[PDB]
Amino acid sequence: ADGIQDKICIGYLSNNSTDTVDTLTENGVPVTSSIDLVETNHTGTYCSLNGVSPIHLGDCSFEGWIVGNPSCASNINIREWSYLIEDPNAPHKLCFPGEVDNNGELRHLFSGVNSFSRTELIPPSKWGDILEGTTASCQNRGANSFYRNLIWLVNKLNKYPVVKGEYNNTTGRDVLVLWGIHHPDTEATANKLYVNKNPYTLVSTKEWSRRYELEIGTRIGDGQRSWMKIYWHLMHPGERITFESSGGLLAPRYGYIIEKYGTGRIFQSGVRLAKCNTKCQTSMGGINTNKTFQNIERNALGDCPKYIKSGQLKLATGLRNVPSIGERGLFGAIAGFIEGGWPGLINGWYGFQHQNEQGTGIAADKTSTQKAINEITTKINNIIEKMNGNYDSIRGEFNQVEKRINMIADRVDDAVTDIWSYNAKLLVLIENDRTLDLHDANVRNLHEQIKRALKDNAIDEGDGCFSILHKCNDSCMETIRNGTYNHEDYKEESQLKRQEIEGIRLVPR
Amino acid sequence: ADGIQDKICIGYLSNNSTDTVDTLTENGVPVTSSIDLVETNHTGTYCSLNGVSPIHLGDCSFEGWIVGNPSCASNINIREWSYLIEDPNAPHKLCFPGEVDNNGELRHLFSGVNSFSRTELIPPSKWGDILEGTTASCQNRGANSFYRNLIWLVNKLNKYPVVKGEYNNTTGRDVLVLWGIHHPDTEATANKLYVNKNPYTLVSTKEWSRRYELEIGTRIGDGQRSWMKIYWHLMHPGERITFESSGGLLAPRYGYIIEKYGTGRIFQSGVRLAKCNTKCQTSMGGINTNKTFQNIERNALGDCPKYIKSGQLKLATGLRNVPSIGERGLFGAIAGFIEGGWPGLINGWYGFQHQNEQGTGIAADKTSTQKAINEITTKINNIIEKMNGNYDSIRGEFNQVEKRINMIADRVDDAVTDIWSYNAKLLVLIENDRTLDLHDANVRNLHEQIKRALKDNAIDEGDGCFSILHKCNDSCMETIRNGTYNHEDYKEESQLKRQEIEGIRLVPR
Amino acid sequence: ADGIQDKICIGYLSNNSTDTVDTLTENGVPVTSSIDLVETNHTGTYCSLNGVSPIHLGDCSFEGWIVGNPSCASNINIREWSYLIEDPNAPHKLCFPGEVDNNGELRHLFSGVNSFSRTELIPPSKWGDILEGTTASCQNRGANSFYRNLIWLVNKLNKYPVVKGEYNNTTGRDVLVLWGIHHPDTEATANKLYVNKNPYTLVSTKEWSRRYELEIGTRIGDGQRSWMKIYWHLMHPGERITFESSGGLLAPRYGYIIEKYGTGRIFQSGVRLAKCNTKCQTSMGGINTNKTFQNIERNALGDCPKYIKSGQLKLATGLRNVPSIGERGLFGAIAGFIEGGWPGLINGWYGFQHQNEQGTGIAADKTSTQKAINEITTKINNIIEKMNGNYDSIRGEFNQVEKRINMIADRVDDAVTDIWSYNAKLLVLIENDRTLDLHDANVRNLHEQIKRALKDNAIDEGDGCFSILHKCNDSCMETIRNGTYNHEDYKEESQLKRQEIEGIRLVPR
Ligand SMILES: *[C@@H]1O[C@H](CO)[C@@H](O[C@@H]2O[C@H](CO)[C@@H](O)[C@H](O)[C@H]2NC(C)=O)[C@H](O)[C@H]1NC(C)=O
Ligand SMILES: *[C@@H]1O[C@H](CO)[C@@H](O[C@@H]2O[C@H](CO)[C@@H](O)[C@H](O)[C@H]2NC(C)=O)[C@H](O)[C@H]1NC(C)=O
Ligand SMILES: *[C@@H]1O[C@H](CO)[C@@H](O[C@@H]2O[C@H](CO)[C@@H](O)[C@H](O)[C@H]2NC(C)=O)[C@H](O)[C@H]1NC(C)=O
Ligand SMILES: *[C@@H]1O[C@H](CO)[C@@H](O)[C@H](O)[C@H]1NC(C)=O
Ligand SMILES: *[C@@H]1O[C@H](CO)[C@@H](O)[C@H](O)[C@H]1NC(C)=O
Ligand SMILES: *[C@@H]1O[C@H](CO)[C@@H](O)[C@H](O)[C@H]1NC(C)=O
């Protein structure tokens, strides 16, 4: 084989790629490394959320649970919940046929509560010479009973005196008060229970006042012909509520002191509750990631990645070290091994390949590569850590008569999602183009530094390599790599070689 | 004229550009081609929406149409609509003075419905020994009548027995049920129509119960001193609804079975309905386009481009091939004709211009240009195709009473629009700079490849051109354009010429 | 001092850099200038908003002011307001214990109104043989009185004939009408005041009708045991409204003609109202800026910069002229002085440094620098002026029972904010990288132009400098700087010097 000048080549050092990304301008570009921006893994279970357990309502509806249906678990010792899990077809709802007023609003505020305590508002004896109505519809502990939170006031010895009770909110926190009205199926039943004709209930704070008369007639709830209407008010501290009645009142007994509420979600039963903890709960499973996007499920709650309508987004970190880079004047070598291995983030090195009479081949340039690792790390950390906003679902709880606002809320959630989706896709494509170009610019700069050191002592082959015009042993090569090579040392030799080469003829002259 | 070396130039080949773009850093840059990102053309009419016709309500208001004002067209054979077109001053509203409860919600739910069927709920005979009220206010072509969907129950032989009727939703779908209450102007009229003292109506499902008494007094509607209140409920499959009255009930006769509703819009009359079809209806006209932005009208429905507050957005595809590029070391030639014509997307070529003793001299480099074409194609398709979310208006139907929520909804639509508008403008400016610089980079790389091929056989004149230091005929030039030129072949000749040129002096030494 | 060639260097001329920015890939990069994109300065006061003063409600609540509590300032002379400032603990509310129906919505429509005129709807005389009730609860300068806007109709000589009154909106404008119902604590008081048994009030337009009976019982408002309910309706032009009562009506007297409403905000008292004018009012103070972002306060109103969750965002405008640019082959000179001083936007010049026998050595290149200034100016103006949307807070006024919708509105505001916050942070980082790189490319292009002019008459030292191979006095230097230098003029001399330099041996042959 013909004799050739010693050579040094500046460019990429890595293994085979096996990892593609897309850029704005090209698909399936092999790169030495990338990271995934989109989380696709989840627990497939309901978990505790940042250390706070949800409440699974089991076989009860929210209304049944909050009003104290005795078929439902008592909330006497509950202190908090991060969210609720409910069976849309729970058999235990209101045990006596009736309805809860403004119940969508109620569901929204109780979707999560960070601090919750049940409290006795008014003791039963306060109402005076009255008896407590119980019913087989609301059995508890083997006997006819009633909702835990309410007292059904009925006559004693065929008399119903005007009953009065009041509660002052001195808790320093908000207090949910529940009360109700029983509406008899017949005037006969109204007279029997309440004695007084046209009985009334008056409920007032300092800010509002409501009066309630009986609405008599037959209803179609299971097991009873009469009906109950349940009402509620959230008292701010300092508020005062009064109750007066001559028949029909379902008196408040227990209520709820709350702080930091409306913080959760009502998820649907089916997916199973597990002993696990995550920072983001979705209807599909819990998510524990530091990624800032997820494509798993739009219905999400907590410290969440933003839901996007997308597949995986691979963000380029490493090199575009492919066979065709020589077409753009660049050099790259593929190796399976290098002393110390490849650096983690970029996989791995800017560096040199040399060839002289003592052999080949490669060595990394640590300084430039470290500069590059610093740049890519800074870019990644900016793209990720600046997403420090609130990215869970834009969402509320609504009842069945609240279709329009429910649709609007869901549409806004979807539109915000469309914005983040497009932006994330385009950002990844654009930045991949930029990252790969930046690596190129970096090795080109290194190449120009070497060019500048060698000056007239080398021929620029235009492919990332220099043919050195003098013998350059491993020690000389090392002076080139560590930036101590002085071209003056080899000027004479190099000029002679240059002259020699100028005279050579492929076809003899 | 003095003798000159043969020469080859590398750069842009195009015709004179006529259209301009803006970039983030420069105004009115002439380029060889661009595409428009914003649709400005529409039909100026109301059209079918993705194959589904709207309903023009003509001389009727929505309330008149839905309750069955006998002066409005019957919806007996209606099966679907994509949207509604309504005259705000339609003469045919509620024919008998009255009001529809929660009618903004009703309008929202019925703004579009993809499956619709009128259905008889309760047969009139079910109400028993009663008669049906008719009135000159709601005439059927000259005959006193009433709303098609309701029955005005009145006394028969001066008796009104308790009436009762019920409907079970067995349809497997949602059913809209309408009923009403007639409130007499006087006690005399109450007694005359309904006979019974203190007439009541009771309507209940298993979920809720409402009781209605008469509210007696003179109203100011046209043609009547009394008043009607109309109520509705949307029944889910399996619900059941019951009605009882001793006077006042406007009994349900027809209801509507509906599927996939709340999908439309109530547009205003004026713009004409035409035989045409479109992916996206606006209040100005229909849009058929593959562009992903429009600046025509914010009130838009369907498979729509995103509305933006912007003029046209021209996305550069072609070259910046202008006289001043020489200042940046770039070469360009302007020709009215080539051969095979110019490429459609970029209009048109990276290539060569040559000059030798045989003549001159233009030819395209197909590989590099096609690479650029694939690049631009990929960019455009990325920008456009990734906008695959939902971009019609964020909007609802609201009545006069719900101004606050109407305003908030409109503001959120406007904020989403502001985000898209700013992002679109900036994306186009930035990407235009990038595209133009990309073409430049591509022809520079071409130039460097030729420079590498020629080596010491040519002088780089820093303007995209190489002066060749040897005779280079058309065969030679073609070896240069096709990558087969071997510099060794001409070494002896080029070194002679170089000596020669090196010895020339403008002013004799 | 060995002999050295004359030299010219092309690159940056500036003073020492006192200012740093961050880029997407690097923190704390010193640049010669930047601008702030985020406003952080404000007045700390409530100001006029675009020429329109707010109203400070002082000692009164909105409700007490709007219904005309005689303890509050009369609005008889008010013509407009941009926003309201209210004390949540304002002592003057409803002077006679009661409530305003739908007061969240009313607050929202009256948050700001651009044209306002109180108007007398119906004279007191119209209600007939009635008297006007007064109370010590609502005093006017010690005199028992009542709300300005209403008349408390009570018996005259123990008769209360049916009272009637009407108002036709013929103003071409929207008209707010207020009315109320007084609800006695006892039947005794009802009979005393109103005489008639079961008194009723009927209020109707052609669009709706409401009937009101008395709700008797004790309430807990200060200083009275009875209760008042206040209602309102905003009449559109052409509307008509009627009032009839046999007892209980608080009859409308004064209403409000309004145009362009719902435009303001109800801010909280505390921050002082000052004599100043701004185009954007926040709860913290007024903002007067051309910046398009603010990080002061999310509760903002008017022609506002967009609130973002961010620190300051510094946009690079100037040069990266640091000691280390030589590593990338770039030249830079630090000077405190230059004739003409440094240009404002970039601080300041692309230029030349020269060295010859006469001395040294700096001069600006005006053409290239002015080109750069035009580029940066154009970029900044695009980034700023394209942000011409509506960026004040997305919010509404809501009462205490409207928690869910309030929370949802606030969450949408927050999500829009999160979008702009991220986008602004990333835009600045990316564009800073691009700006610094653009300055570099500009000076490299100048460098290449000079290189092209010098041809073989200079050695490119790789550091932005050329060692000129012939003597090059100030005149010659100036021909290099103004582009008239002809390399042919110096060919002989240059070749001789090159040969000399070639033959020299730092280390002897
Ligand atoms: C709720 O708070 C109110 C206000 O403090 C209490 O009413 C007062 O009770 C005190 C003590 O008997 C009386 O001296 C005052 O005259 C009352 N003020 C008024 C205006 O009623 C009330 O007792 C508290 N209720 C409960 C159940 O604790
Ligand atoms: C509506 O559905 C109910 C079912 O709940 C029907 O009422 C039942 O009628 C059947 C005979 O048809 C009786 O055996 C059941 O005891 C009834 N159930 C209850 C709980 O009342 C009712 O007949 C249906 N009405 C219509 C209009 O079809
Ligand atoms: C409000 O408008 C109505 C309708 O125009 C007025 O009623 C008319 O008034 C004239 C003068 O008395 C009568 O001749 C008409 O017969 C009335 N028309 C009807 C249908 O009632 C009414 O007077 C106006 N009221 C006020 C206070 O301006
Ligand atoms: C660089 O290389 C030479 C030969 O390996 C070595 O002797 C010298 O100390 C090195 N210089 C520096 C500063 O690394
Ligand atoms: C390139 O040009 C030469 C001379 O015209 C021709 O003979 C040769 O076949 C060409 N080579 C290729 C690869 O097209
Ligand atoms: C450039 O510089 C030379 C020397 O000062 C001067 O004579 C000449 O007029 C200048 N040319 C132009 C075009 O400004």
PDB file of all heavy atoms in Angstrom, chain A residues 99 216 222 400 404 411 418 422 505 509, chain B residues 105 209-210 236 383 390 392 402 492 495:
ATOM      1  N   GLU A  99     -84.634  14.583  47.412  1.00  0.00           N
ATOM      2  CA  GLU A  99     -83.623  15.178  46.548  1.00  0.00           C
ATOM      3  C   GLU A  99     -82.752  16.137  47.345  1.00  0.00           C
ATOM      4  O   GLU A  99     -83.177  16.683  48.344  1.00  0.00           O
ATOM      5  CB  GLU A  99     -84.307  15.922  45.389  1.00  0.00           C
ATOM      6  CG  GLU A  99     -85.332  16.948  45.883  1.00  0.00           C
ATOM      7  CD  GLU A  99     -86.184  17.536  44.761  1.00  0.00           C
ATOM      8  OE1 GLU A  99     -85.748  18.508  44.125  1.00  0.00           O
ATOM      9  OE2 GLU A  99     -87.300  17.032  44.524  1.00  0.00           O
ATOM     10  N   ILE A 216     -97.843  19.101  49.161  1.00  0.00           N
ATOM     11  CA  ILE A 216     -98.499  17.826  49.420  1.00  0.00           C
ATOM     12  C   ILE A 216     -98.818  17.066  48.140  1.00  0.00           C
ATOM     13  O   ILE A 216     -99.225  17.649  47.128  1.00  0.00           O
ATOM     14  CB  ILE A 216     -99.744  18.028  50.331  1.00  0.00           C
ATOM     15  CG1 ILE A 216     -99.284  18.143  51.795  1.00  0.00           C
ATOM     16  CG2 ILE A 216    -100.710  16.862  50.236  1.00  0.00           C
ATOM     17  CD1 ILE A 216     -99.654  19.441  52.482  1.00  0.00           C
ATOM     18  N   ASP A 222     -89.117   4.777  45.805  1.00  0.00           N
ATOM     19  CA  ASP A 222     -89.362   3.425  46.278  1.00  0.00           C
ATOM     20  C   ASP A 222     -89.744   3.401  47.758  1.00  0.00           C
ATOM     21  O   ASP A 222     -89.072   4.011  48.592  1.00  0.00           O
ATOM     22  CB  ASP A 222     -88.127   2.548  46.068  1.00  0.00           C
ATOM     23  CG  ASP A 222     -87.759   2.372  44.597  1.00  0.00           C
ATOM     24  OD1 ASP A 222     -88.667   2.364  43.740  1.00  0.00           O
ATOM     25  OD2 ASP A 222     -86.548   2.227  44.315  1.00  0.00           O
ATOM     26  N   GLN A 400     -77.114  16.582  36.727  1.00  0.00           N
ATOM     27  CA  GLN A 400     -77.654  16.282  35.406  1.00  0.00           C
ATOM     28  C   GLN A 400     -78.367  17.460  34.730  1.00  0.00           C
ATOM     29  O   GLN A 400     -78.598  17.426  33.521  1.00  0.00           O
ATOM     30  CB  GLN A 400     -78.532  15.024  35.450  1.00  0.00           C
ATOM     31  CG  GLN A 400     -77.774  13.743  35.829  1.00  0.00           C
ATOM     32  CD  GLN A 400     -77.089  13.091  34.643  1.00  0.00           C
ATOM     33  OE1 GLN A 400     -77.107  13.630  33.535  1.00  0.00           O
ATOM     34  NE2 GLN A 400     -76.490  11.922  34.865  1.00  0.00           N
ATOM     35  N   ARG A 404     -74.997  22.512  30.145  1.00  0.00           N
ATOM     36  CA  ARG A 404     -74.315  23.578  29.394  1.00  0.00           C
ATOM     37  C   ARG A 404     -72.973  23.982  30.020  1.00  0.00           C
ATOM     38  O   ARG A 404     -71.940  23.998  29.337  1.00  0.00           O
ATOM     39  CB  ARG A 404     -75.220  24.807  29.199  1.00  0.00           C
ATOM     40  CG  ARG A 404     -74.520  26.006  28.534  1.00  0.00           C
ATOM     41  CD  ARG A 404     -75.428  27.242  28.418  1.00  0.00           C
ATOM     42  NE  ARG A 404     -75.911  27.687  29.725  1.00  0.00           N
ATOM     43  CZ  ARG A 404     -76.920  28.537  29.924  1.00  0.00           C
ATOM     44  NH1 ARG A 404     -77.584  29.063  28.899  1.00  0.00           N
ATOM     45  NH2 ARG A 404     -77.269  28.862  31.161  1.00  0.00           N
ATOM     46  N   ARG A 411     -64.926  21.882  27.243  1.00  0.00           N
ATOM     47  CA  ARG A 411     -64.384  22.483  26.022  1.00  0.00           C
ATOM     48  C   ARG A 411     -63.161  23.363  26.307  1.00  0.00           C
ATOM     49  O   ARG A 411     -62.185  23.345  25.558  1.00  0.00           O
ATOM     50  CB  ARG A 411     -65.452  23.293  25.267  1.00  0.00           C
ATOM     51  CG  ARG A 411     -64.900  23.932  23.962  1.00  0.00           C
ATOM     52  CD  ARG A 411     -64.439  22.851  22.979  1.00  0.00           C
ATOM     53  NE  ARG A 411     -63.536  23.390  21.958  1.00  0.00           N
ATOM     54  CZ  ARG A 411     -63.949  24.120  20.927  1.00  0.00           C
ATOM     55  NH1 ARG A 411     -65.244  24.391  20.794  1.00  0.00           N
ATOM     56  NH2 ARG A 411     -63.076  24.584  20.041  1.00  0.00           N
ATOM     57  N   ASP A 418     -55.294  21.529  23.438  1.00  0.00           N
ATOM     58  CA  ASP A 418     -54.899  21.673  22.030  1.00  0.00           C
ATOM     59  C   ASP A 418     -53.711  22.636  21.874  1.00  0.00           C
ATOM     60  O   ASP A 418     -52.796  22.429  21.043  1.00  0.00           O
ATOM     61  CB  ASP A 418     -56.088  22.174  21.195  1.00  0.00           C
ATOM     62  CG  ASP A 418     -57.059  21.065  20.825  1.00  0.00           C
ATOM     63  OD1 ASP A 418     -56.769  19.881  21.107  1.00  0.00           O
ATOM     64  OD2 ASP A 418     -58.110  21.385  20.229  1.00  0.00           O
ATOM     65  N   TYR A 422     -50.059  21.209  20.411  1.00  0.00           N
ATOM     66  CA  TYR A 422     -49.355  21.736  19.235  1.00  0.00           C
ATOM     67  C   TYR A 422     -47.993  22.300  19.616  1.00  0.00           C
ATOM     68  O   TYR A 422     -46.972  22.005  18.973  1.00  0.00           O
ATOM     69  CB  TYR A 422     -50.196  22.821  18.557  1.00  0.00           C
ATOM     70  CG  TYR A 422     -49.627  23.298  17.238  1.00  0.00           C
ATOM     71  CD1 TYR A 422     -49.720  22.509  16.098  1.00  0.00           C
ATOM     72  CD2 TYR A 422     -49.012  24.539  17.132  1.00  0.00           C
ATOM     73  CE1 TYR A 422     -49.211  22.939  14.889  1.00  0.00           C
ATOM     74  CE2 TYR A 422     -48.492  24.982  15.923  1.00  0.00           C
ATOM     75  CZ  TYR A 422     -48.605  24.181  14.807  1.00  0.00           C
ATOM     76  OH  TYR A 422     -48.102  24.614  13.602  1.00  0.00           O
ATOM     77  N   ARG A 505       3.321  13.041  -9.754  1.00  0.00           N
ATOM     78  CA  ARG A 505       2.363  12.970 -10.862  1.00  0.00           C
ATOM     79  C   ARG A 505       1.713  11.588 -10.956  1.00  0.00           C
ATOM     80  O   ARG A 505       2.402  10.564 -11.043  1.00  0.00           O
ATOM     81  CB  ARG A 505       3.048  13.314 -12.187  1.00  0.00           C
ATOM     82  CG  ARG A 505       3.579  14.753 -12.285  1.00  0.00           C
ATOM     83  CD  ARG A 505       2.440  15.750 -12.482  1.00  0.00           C
ATOM     84  NE  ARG A 505       2.923  17.119 -12.659  1.00  0.00           N
ATOM     85  CZ  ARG A 505       3.242  17.940 -11.661  1.00  0.00           C
ATOM     86  NH1 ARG A 505       3.132  17.541 -10.395  1.00  0.00           N
ATOM     87  NH2 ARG A 505       3.673  19.170 -11.926  1.00  0.00           N
ATOM     88  N   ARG A 509       4.388  12.991 -16.199  1.00  0.00           N
ATOM     89  CA  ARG A 509       4.297  14.122 -17.108  1.00  0.00           C
ATOM     90  C   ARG A 509       5.097  13.800 -18.344  1.00  0.00           C
ATOM     91  O   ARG A 509       4.907  14.408 -19.401  1.00  0.00           O
ATOM     92  CB  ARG A 509       4.801  15.401 -16.452  1.00  0.00           C
ATOM     93  CG  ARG A 509       6.282  15.428 -16.178  1.00  0.00           C
ATOM     94  CD  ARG A 509       6.709  16.795 -15.646  1.00  0.00           C
ATOM     95  NE  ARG A 509       6.471  17.878 -16.599  1.00  0.00           N
ATOM     96  CZ  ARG A 509       7.389  18.356 -17.438  1.00  0.00           C
ATOM     97  NH1 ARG A 509       8.615  17.844 -17.456  1.00  0.00           N
ATOM     98  NH2 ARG A 509       7.085  19.347 -18.269  1.00  0.00           N
TER      99      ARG A 509
ATOM    100  N   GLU B 105     -80.511  27.361  28.449  1.00  0.00           N
ATOM    101  CA  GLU B 105     -79.997  25.998  28.515  1.00  0.00           C
ATOM    102  C   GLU B 105     -80.641  25.143  27.423  1.00  0.00           C
ATOM    103  O   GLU B 105     -79.986  24.308  26.799  1.00  0.00           O
ATOM    104  CB  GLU B 105     -80.282  25.399  29.897  1.00  0.00           C
ATOM    105  CG  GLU B 105     -79.775  23.975  30.077  1.00  0.00           C
ATOM    106  CD  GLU B 105     -78.347  23.923  30.584  1.00  0.00           C
ATOM    107  OE1 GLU B 105     -77.905  24.922  31.188  1.00  0.00           O
ATOM    108  OE2 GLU B 105     -77.676  22.881  30.399  1.00  0.00           O
ATOM    109  N   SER B 209     -89.088  16.387  42.474  1.00  0.00           N
ATOM    110  CA  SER B 209     -90.523  16.655  42.559  1.00  0.00           C
ATOM    111  C   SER B 209     -90.822  18.149  42.618  1.00  0.00           C
ATOM    112  O   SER B 209     -90.266  18.876  43.440  1.00  0.00           O
ATOM    113  CB  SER B 209     -91.146  15.959  43.771  1.00  0.00           C
ATOM    114  OG  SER B 209     -92.560  15.957  43.660  1.00  0.00           O
ATOM    115  N   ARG B 210     -91.714  18.600  41.746  1.00  0.00           N
ATOM    116  CA  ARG B 210     -92.106  20.007  41.697  1.00  0.00           C
ATOM    117  C   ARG B 210     -93.628  20.126  41.834  1.00  0.00           C
ATOM    118  O   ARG B 210     -94.388  19.357  41.233  1.00  0.00           O
ATOM    119  CB  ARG B 210     -91.654  20.649  40.385  1.00  0.00           C
ATOM    120  CG  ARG B 210     -90.138  20.609  40.137  1.00  0.00           C
ATOM    121  CD  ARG B 210     -89.344  21.482  41.122  1.00  0.00           C
ATOM    122  NE  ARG B 210     -87.896  21.430  40.875  1.00  0.00           N
ATOM    123  CZ  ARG B 210     -87.053  20.596  41.483  1.00  0.00           C
ATOM    124  NH1 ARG B 210     -87.491  19.723  42.385  1.00  0.00           N
ATOM    125  NH2 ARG B 210     -85.758  20.635  41.189  1.00  0.00           N
ATOM    126  N   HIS B 236     -83.168  10.815  30.959  1.00  0.00           N
ATOM    127  CA  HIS B 236     -82.214   9.787  30.539  1.00  0.00           C
ATOM    128  C   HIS B 236     -82.981   8.474  30.417  1.00  0.00           C
ATOM    129  O   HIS B 236     -84.084   8.360  30.956  1.00  0.00           O
ATOM    130  CB  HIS B 236     -81.057   9.671  31.545  1.00  0.00           C
ATOM    131  CG  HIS B 236     -80.076  10.798  31.460  1.00  0.00           C
ATOM    132  ND1 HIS B 236     -79.668  11.337  30.256  1.00  0.00           N
ATOM    133  CD2 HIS B 236     -79.434  11.504  32.423  1.00  0.00           C
ATOM    134  CE1 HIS B 236     -78.819  12.323  30.484  1.00  0.00           C
ATOM    135  NE2 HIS B 236     -78.656  12.444  31.788  1.00  0.00           N
ATOM    136  N   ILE B 383     -45.928  21.794  10.250  1.00  0.00           N
ATOM    137  CA  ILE B 383     -46.627  22.976  10.751  1.00  0.00           C
ATOM    138  C   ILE B 383     -48.141  22.833  10.619  1.00  0.00           C
ATOM    139  O   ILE B 383     -48.891  23.155  11.541  1.00  0.00           O
ATOM    140  CB  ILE B 383     -46.150  24.265  10.038  1.00  0.00           C
ATOM    141  CG1 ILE B 383     -44.707  24.579  10.423  1.00  0.00           C
ATOM    142  CG2 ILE B 383     -47.061  25.452  10.398  1.00  0.00           C
ATOM    143  CD1 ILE B 383     -44.004  25.528   9.461  1.00  0.00           C
ATOM    144  N   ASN B 390     -59.250  20.877  18.015  1.00  0.00           N
ATOM    145  CA  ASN B 390     -60.577  21.428  17.763  1.00  0.00           C
ATOM    146  C   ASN B 390     -60.524  22.947  17.857  1.00  0.00           C
ATOM    147  O   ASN B 390     -60.248  23.493  18.928  1.00  0.00           O
ATOM    148  CB  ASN B 390     -61.622  20.847  18.738  1.00  0.00           C
ATOM    149  CG  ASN B 390     -61.668  19.323  18.711  1.00  0.00           C
ATOM    150  OD1 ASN B 390     -62.015  18.725  17.692  1.00  0.00           O
ATOM    151  ND2 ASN B 390     -61.328  18.687  19.838  1.00  0.00           N
ATOM    152  N   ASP B 392     -62.957  25.405  16.378  1.00  0.00           N
ATOM    153  CA  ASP B 392     -64.112  26.281  16.221  1.00  0.00           C
ATOM    154  C   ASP B 392     -64.347  27.054  17.515  1.00  0.00           C
ATOM    155  O   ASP B 392     -63.635  26.838  18.498  1.00  0.00           O
ATOM    156  CB  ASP B 392     -65.359  25.543  15.722  1.00  0.00           C
ATOM    157  CG  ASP B 392     -65.931  24.565  16.738  1.00  0.00           C
ATOM    158  OD1 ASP B 392     -65.390  24.444  17.862  1.00  0.00           O
ATOM    159  OD2 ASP B 392     -66.937  23.911  16.397  1.00  0.00           O
ATOM    160  N   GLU B 402     -78.652  35.704  31.382  1.00  0.00           N
ATOM    161  CA  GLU B 402     -77.326  35.149  31.702  1.00  0.00           C
ATOM    162  C   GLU B 402     -76.147  35.898  31.048  1.00  0.00           C
ATOM    163  O   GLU B 402     -75.277  35.303  30.389  1.00  0.00           O
ATOM    164  CB  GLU B 402     -77.284  33.640  31.430  1.00  0.00           C
ATOM    165  CG  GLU B 402     -78.086  33.228  30.242  1.00  0.00           C
ATOM    166  CD  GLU B 402     -78.647  31.811  30.346  1.00  0.00           C
ATOM    167  OE1 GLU B 402     -78.964  31.327  31.455  1.00  0.00           O
ATOM    168  OE2 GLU B 402     -78.794  31.196  29.285  1.00  0.00           O
ATOM    169  N   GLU B 492      -0.489  18.719 -13.422  1.00  0.00           N
ATOM    170  CA  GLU B 492       0.596  19.320 -14.209  1.00  0.00           C
ATOM    171  C   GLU B 492       0.139  20.587 -14.938  1.00  0.00           C
ATOM    172  O   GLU B 492       0.878  21.570 -14.977  1.00  0.00           O
ATOM    173  CB  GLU B 492       1.196  18.307 -15.196  1.00  0.00           C
ATOM    174  CG  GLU B 492       2.059  18.902 -16.333  1.00  0.00           C
ATOM    175  CD  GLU B 492       3.530  19.051 -15.975  1.00  0.00           C
ATOM    176  OE1 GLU B 492       3.943  18.563 -14.899  1.00  0.00           O
ATOM    177  OE2 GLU B 492       4.281  19.648 -16.779  1.00  0.00           O
ATOM    178  N   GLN B 495      -0.626  23.534 -12.236  1.00  0.00           N
ATOM    179  CA  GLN B 495       0.549  24.114 -11.601  1.00  0.00           C
ATOM    180  C   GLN B 495       1.273  25.052 -12.565  1.00  0.00           C
ATOM    181  O   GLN B 495       1.926  26.018 -12.142  1.00  0.00           O
ATOM    182  CB  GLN B 495       1.498  23.033 -11.065  1.00  0.00           C
ATOM    183  CG  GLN B 495       0.920  22.239  -9.884  1.00  0.00           C
ATOM    184  CD  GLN B 495       1.926  21.249  -9.320  1.00  0.00           C
ATOM    185  OE1 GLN B 495       2.970  21.017  -9.916  1.00  0.00           O
ATOM    186  NE2 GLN B 495       1.616  20.664  -8.174  1.00  0.00           N
TER     187      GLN B 495
END
